[PDB]
Amino acid sequence: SSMSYSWTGALITPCSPEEEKLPINPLSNSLLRYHNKVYCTTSKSASQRAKKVTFDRTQVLDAHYDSVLKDIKLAASKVSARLLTLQQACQLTPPHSARSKYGFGAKEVRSLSGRAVNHIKSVWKDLLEDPQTPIPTTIMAKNEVFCVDPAKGGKKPARLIVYPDLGVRVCEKMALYDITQKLPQAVMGASYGFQYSPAQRVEYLLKAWAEKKDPMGFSYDTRCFDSTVTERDIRTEESIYQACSLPEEARTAIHSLTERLYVGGPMFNSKGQTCGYRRCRASGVLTTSMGNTITCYVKALAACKAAGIVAPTMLVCGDDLVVISESQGTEEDERNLRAFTEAMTRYSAPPGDPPRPEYDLELITSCSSNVSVALGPRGRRRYYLTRDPTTPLARAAWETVRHSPINSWLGNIIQYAPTIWVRMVLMTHFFSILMVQDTLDQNLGGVNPLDLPAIIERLHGLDAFSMHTYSHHELTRVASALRKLGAPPLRVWKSRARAVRASLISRGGKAAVCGRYLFNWAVKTKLKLTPLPEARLLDLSSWF
């Protein structure tokens, strides 16, 4: 029926030319040794990407699909959404968002400068007047950092970014922002992935698992989900948006955005030549996350009914998806997943590798991570979110003239605080670097490191500081990842840890608390850690 992309042969071309690595990585050459293995995706590999993502889609919908859609549109109907003022939409632009072809950028937009405002007014008008002319976009290589995978053929090529001009982006929000805030929750309820913190994601999966008499779970991904989205899928999204109570202006606005932007349109490289034409999901438009999540949800829910998945509970993180249901016997279970996959494929949403039924929660991966179990010092099982540390570690080792990894360290420490690799490797390194630099309280991305104990307590609870015995899977993976990157093994970290712990303790104050709480696993004679008052008086609902 249609190709995801047509190309012209023009090259997809960098902005600020990707930078060579330096002969010394002073912040991380004591973290690991195999620096030769950490690499960053460049536009040089962008053709290789484009090939992987360009293919023919044909889609066959059915009664299950129709039925699911009817249900969702009824759900959407209960939502009412407002317009955002041009000004409000401007204020939601991020500080460093890509400046505009019309001599102004984010600072102007956020400060409501007259010409920025003015231009957007015209952009919005043209949207109201013209429902047809496709709106042009730029395509860029994403630069991300990985550890080399010999298994999966060396170096992943870059991801492709496709976005309209800043003027349009502001406009998108006037039209759709409020819907992005309300629609997903209303169509999917608890299935919606982005609402939860790690601990809550854990809890939900556990609850889901627990309520099946005889549970079975699987995850489904596709690497290339955007490519598989059809013009029709996109129009179906609009129709879903339209089932809401909107003002009329917004309805027009949305239709135009669908017809002129979302459904597809032409692509230019930064050099400014025509590069190709897109007939699938745009990587950088407002609706990308909402849209993928909803469309994925519709397709998956239909496919469950097609396959006879019994009593399914879903978690949806975009392209990424977990289903936990009632097992029907493993032989039936294997059959129903083949059927699910076949149905998904008819819907134009094939998988990466085919899914597989599992009967143990540790073996189920999604939003790139998994639930694991650790034993408190007296037997109690605690469950918590974790993942393969390889990428976190490669990212932790990426240092250039224009990039520092300390941020990346702290992000991981927070999200994965209960993990053995965070607690033994990253925590130990982070604190040691900051102490030597004497910047133990400079603020990184809005968080002060000396507040980790309370933040971690607030987020993960006091168990985060007493996970005593980790699982075989987890021990195996971590050890293995460390050997892979040439990082010291856990035993060496434990040493480093003891000395970090001491320095933090002698430093007194909040440092001493970091010492006591974060590094209690490092000493055989444990301090009794009690709740931090600093922590109850603290709200991070904002973050997850």
Annotated binding site: 221, 319-320
Q: Contact, 337 vs 356, CB < 8 A? A: yes
Q: Please tell me the distance from the alpha carbon of residue 251 to that of residue 231, in angstroms, as a whole number.
A: 19
Written as six digits, the tokens of 365 are 């991966």
Annotated binding site for Mg(2+): 221, 319-320
- 82: closest CA among 183, 167, 175? 175
Run of H or E including 504? helix 490-506
DSSP string, 287-329: THHHHHHHHHHHHHHHHHHHHT-EEEEEEE-SS-EEEEEE---
Strands (E) in 31-135, as ranges, are 38-40, 56-57
Q: Contact, 259 vs 234, CB < 8 A? A: no
- 392: closest CA among 475, 466, 485? 485
- Mapped onto helix, strand or coil, the DSSP state of residue 38 is strand
Q: Which residue, chain included where needed, has tokens 């999604």?
A: 366
- 387: closest CA among 406, 423, 362? 362
3-state helix, strand, coil in the chain (%, to 5): 50, 15, 35
Residue 203 dihedral angles phi and psi, to the nearest 5°: -55, -50
Beta-sheet strand order (sheet of 137-141)? 5-7, 274-278, 265-268, 137-141, 160-163
